[PDB]
């Protein structure tokens, strides 16, 4: 334990500059939804609440890009756990309060999927959230966007059952907008495919409903 401490209560925006796991203590001025991440979403963070310590969301998976969407209350203390990495380039933790559609993603870790090929099978293994807890996946459909071209996408898991919510994302100067694409996807061994636009960005929210395995394994299979 080498707890570093943020001097004053975070406002809406904040940037905290930084080979061993340490913790960052902070409070927020206004209760609300916060996006917390490193640069650039490396490494993945975990966040805790100081009981008066309880886990909230986030995983510890090496080389895995992600950010946190979490509801922070003004009259509570929170801890960010940053794991050991590699001392090449300096890091920093970014804090932004979100009043928009990101509300649909609390309290979830949002995985950044950045290695999708034209077609084929893809799977991403993370530590599974507890029953009724959330893990999300932000991905871009391969290919150039033309509001016409489309790939077929099969989303499913291997052991744990979960309810999926699929959003399409658009961005303004105010942040993300989330548009409903598909609700109530039963993910365990799901054979249903959905046609999604090439070049479009999507976010899948996964609520674990059956904890059958320590790791949750999201599959993204792409056909023409």
């Amino acid at each position: 334990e080498n707890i570093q401490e943020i001097n004053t209560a975070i406002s809406d925006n904040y940037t905290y500059n930084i080979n061993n796991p340490f913790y960052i203590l902070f409070t927020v001025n206004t209760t609300g939804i916060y996006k917390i991440n490193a640069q650039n979403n490396l490494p993945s963070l975990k966040i805790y609440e100081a009981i008066g310590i309880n886990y909230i969301t986030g995983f510890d998976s090496p080389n895995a890009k992600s950010y946190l969407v979490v509801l922070l209350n003004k009259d509570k203390n929170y801890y960010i756990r940053v794991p050991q990495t590699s001392s090449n380039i300096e890091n920093q933790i970014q804090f932004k309060r979100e009043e928009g559609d990101l509300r649909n993603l609390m309290n979830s870790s949002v995985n950044i999927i950045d290695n999708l090929n034209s077609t084929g099978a893809h799977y991403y293994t993370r530590q599974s959230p507890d029953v009724h807890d959330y893990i999300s996946y932000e991905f871009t459909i391969p290919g150039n966007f033309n509001n016409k071209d489309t790939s077929n996408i099969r989303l499913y898991t291997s052991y744990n059952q979960g309810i999926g919510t699929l959003f399409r994302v658009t961005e303004t100067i105010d942040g993300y907008n989330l548009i409903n694409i598909q609700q109530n996807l039963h993910l365990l061994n799901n054979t249903n495919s959905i046609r999604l636009l090439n070049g479009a960005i999507y976010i899948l929210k996964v609520e674990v409903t059956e904890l059958n395995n320590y790791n949750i394994r999201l599959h993204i299979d792409i056909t023409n």
């Binding site: 966007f145 509001n147 658009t170 961005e171 303004t172 100067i173 907008n177 070049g199 479009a200």
Partner: protein
């Protein structure tokens, strides 16, 4: 710090073609063949105080993309009609809304097509409802 449409020069293309570039022809705006001239280049600047973007022509850096009283996009001196609120729906793909309500609705850039052909069409300002209208989709590409 701003990842959303950073300041600088861009080329503006319609989603219908990758070889037609936006430029002023007479007092109108249309998509034409690549010319490598300053008029097909557009300086995009963020206005922090009004939370929007203004876009000026490089050949005439004092003229901004605006709109007249006839539904046409125009190139004129800076005014609130030059204030755009872009919606990024894909990589470098935007919907360009007027910051202020026009006729009590969201209005956007709109290029008409004849089977995906947009040659000789003027860029217009028309009502917007969603993110699925190809005619209101434009690619802004640095630099």
């Amino acid at each position: 710090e701003r990842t959303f449409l950073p300041n600088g020069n861009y080329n503006i293309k319609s989603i219908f073609s990758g070889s037609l570039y936006l430029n002023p022809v007479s007092k109108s705006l249309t998509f034409s063949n690549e010319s490598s001239a300053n008029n097909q280049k557009w300086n995009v600047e963020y206005m922090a105080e009004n939370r929007c973007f203004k876009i000026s022509n490089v050949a005439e850096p004092n003229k901004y993309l605006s709109y007249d009283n006839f539904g046409f996009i125009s190139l004129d001196s800076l005014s609130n009609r030059c204030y755009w609120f872009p919606i990024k729906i894909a990589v470098n793909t935007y919907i360009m809304l007027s910051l202020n309500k026009v006729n009590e609705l969201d209005y956007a850039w709109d290029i008409y097509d004849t089977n995906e052909n947009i040659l000789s069409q003027p860029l217009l300002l028309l009502p917007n409802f969603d993110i699925y209208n190809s005619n209101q989709m434009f690619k802004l590409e640095k630099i």
